[PDB]
Design a protein around this nucleic acid. Sequence first.
DNA 1: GAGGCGTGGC
DNA 2: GCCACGCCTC
Length: 84
Amino acid sequence: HTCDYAGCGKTYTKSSHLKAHLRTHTGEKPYHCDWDGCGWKFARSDDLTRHYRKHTGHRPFQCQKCDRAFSRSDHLALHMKRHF
DNA sequence: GAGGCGTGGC
DNA sequence: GCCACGCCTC
Ligand SMILES: [Zn+2]
Ligand SMILES: [Zn+2]
Ligand SMILES: [Zn+2]
């Protein structure tokens, strides 16, 4: 698995990874936003999932030692380290 | 917090 | 391919 574009030599493990990377060279964005009047599109599926947080303000990851909640797991993981 | 992105089990 | 974990950088 290797990117065969103009000069890019980046190599990935799976083909799923390589296929996604090539979207940076083509600008293809297969993942559209179904929100009414948004029209946004993204290269990665997880990128679109985050954009839905904007419209919904959803925050599923909640700190069990606080009332705070977060949109992403890595946000909560860093907050938890603050409680030690 | 947000964006970009590398990665692995399924 | 999906999707989730999680590191990097600002
Ligand atoms: Zn490339
Ligand atoms: Zn949208
Ligand atoms: Zn907390």
